[PDB]
Amino acid sequence: HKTSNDYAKIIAIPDIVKDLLSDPSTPTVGPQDANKAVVVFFDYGCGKCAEISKEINKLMKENPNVKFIFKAYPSVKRDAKVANYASLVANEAYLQGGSELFLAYNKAIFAQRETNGELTDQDVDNVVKRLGIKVNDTKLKQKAAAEELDTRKLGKLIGFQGPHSFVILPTNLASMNANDLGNNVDKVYVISDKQTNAITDNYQQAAKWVATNIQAQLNNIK
Ligand SMILES: [Zn+2]
Ligand SMILES: [Zn+2]
Ligand SMILES: [Zn+2]
């Protein structure tokens, strides 16, 4: 099995674990005292992420005690400026309205993408206006054009090459030191983007496989 990345081993250091689980600016859903977490790397401009998002919505309802953490990873396929902008707006929606406003924004952006076959900056602005999100759109647009997302840098550091990468892990790894964490690499479970892309080209059956696999891993954490 050459050319396989040891994602769990890379993840299992305090710096990366706390970024995955404890970044206050990253949109989350579910209780802060959840014992289990699912980290979703996603791309608002990606049609497959749009199908996956709907399966994740169901997963969150089926697992109300589980924490879901949404890390934006715009694909290196497309220009990232729009997806960057939409992700930066998602951060402001989460800071203002918490999980609830984030989910409404999140669901509405992916609906635009699933519907039109593309995402535009006007799609973001109209969702912003509609849901009453306060943004300095000029500043965020410039940031979207100028910077790489920190959530994308995190995903790249882990070894993911793109969105629909997932990490399922216990939340108590956030309180472990480097020695503790290295003895607990086994508790870090990863569905890589290479795995997700190897499934199929049917977006829906890929989303359903991902959801079924996440549920099993969740079931397997104490
Ligand atoms: Zn084998
Ligand atoms: Zn995707
Ligand atoms: Zn394989």
Q: What is the resolution of this structure in A?
A: 2.0
Between CA 150 and CA 19 the distance in angstroms is 10
Between CA 124 and CA 129 the distance in angstroms is 9
2 found inside a domain:
no
- Residue matched to tokens 């674990």: 17
164 assigned ligand-binding residue: yes
How much distance in Å is there from the Cα of 8 to the middle of ligand 3? 16
97 found inside a domain:
yes
How much distance in Å is there from the Cα of 195 to the middle of ligand 3? 7
Domain, as residue range, for 203 = 7-220
1 assigned ligand-binding residue: yes
How much distance in Å is there from the Cα of 65 to the middle of ligand 2? 25
1 found inside a domain:
no
How much distance in Å is there from the Cα of 12 to the middle of ligand 2? 25
Burial of 16 from C-beta contacts in 10 A (0-12 / 13-18 / 19+): middle
Way the structure was solved: X-ray
Cβ atoms of 53 and 110 closer than 8 Å: yes
Structural domain count of the chain: 1
215 found inside a domain:
yes
187 found inside a domain:
yes
Q: Indicate which CATH number applies to the domain containing 106.
A: 3.40.30.10
194 found inside a domain:
yes
14 assigned ligand-binding residue: no
171 found inside a domain:
yes
Strands of the sheet containing 189-191, edge to edge, are 28-29, 67-72, 36-42, 165-170, 189-191
Measured at the CA of 152, the angle between CA 47 and CA 150, to 5 degrees, comes to 135
